[PDB]
């Protein structure tokens, strides 16, 4: 059914490392468009939505739509045995997911057969949403801010306007805020702070969840934070072509 070759194992290792603390069990959905993941955390507070498009492989072969029901701790233990720069092949007929890891250096071949589980898909359809505000910023800036504020608060408020974005919190020790002004960096474009906003918007979120999403920082140099009073927060790590890792987070009210 499935024969999918990635030039570098790196991508799959980072995706699973980014997702495994939010979501234990989940289905990888394989079709002719490529490999998708849609999984809620147990609280139904956070939704992970990943698509690795067929274009991203070399080659990608799906003859039949299949779900790979995987425990992400099991999958992590197997992916740890892959070097970042190994050529990774996924194969399935399925009771088992076959993984092959080939060295970029030696002629070494790693072969894993991972026991799959039957997992009932909880898939929900997400509408194309016109957000009130989007902030593009460096991934590491978002990681720094969420980690720093989590030391002193369980919650962060995200305020956006034309000028900039403010992350603020209060706790036992007092108040904290971090303010980023809209700015274009000509030399280092990934260091830019870009703000598209139809209207000012302010919402409050669990820092525990945001810090978890920031484990995806190594997948993408920039992160898109999308805000609306009506809908959940979108934290998007856009990848090469139209592939993506997206985190959706219900706000505190």
């Amino acid at each position: 059914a499935l024969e999918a070759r990635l030039e570098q194992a790196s991508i799959l290792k980072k995706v699973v490392d980014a997702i495994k603390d939010l979501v234990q069990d989940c289905n990888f959905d394989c079709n002719d468009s490529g490999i998708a993941l849609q999984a809620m955390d147990n609280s139904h507070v956070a939704l992970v939505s990943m698509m690795l498009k067929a274009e991203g492989f070399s080659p990608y072969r799906c003859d039949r739509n299949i779900a790979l029901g995987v425990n992400l701790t099991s999958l992590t233990k197997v992916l740890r045995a892959a070097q970042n720069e190994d050529i990774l092949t996924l194969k399935a007929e399925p009771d088992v997911l076959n993984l092959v890891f080939e060295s970029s250096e030696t002629d070494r071949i790693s072969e894993y057969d991972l026991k799959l589980m039957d997992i009932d898909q909880e898939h929900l359809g997400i509408p194309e949403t016109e957000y009130a505000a989007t902030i593009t910023m460096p991934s590491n800036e978002f990681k720094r801010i969420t980690t720093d504020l989590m030391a002193m608060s369980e919650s962060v408020t995200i305020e956006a306007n034309k000028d900039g974005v403010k992350f603020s919190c209060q706790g036992d020790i007092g108040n904290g805020s971090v303010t980023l002004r809209q700015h274009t960096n000509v030399e280092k474009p990934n260091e830019s702070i870009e703000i598209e906003l139809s209207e000012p918007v302010s919402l409050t979120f669990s820092l525990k969840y945001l810090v978890n999403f920031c484990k995806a920082s190594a997948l993408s140099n920039t992160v898109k934070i999308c805000l609306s009073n009506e809908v959940p927060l979108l934290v998007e790590y856009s990848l090469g072509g139209s592939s993506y890792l997206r985190f959706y987070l219900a706000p505190k009210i």
Binding site: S43, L124, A250, K252
Partner: peptide
Amino acid sequence: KHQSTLNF
């Protein structure tokens, strides 16, 4: 501010 659940 209590934690809501996802609503799309």
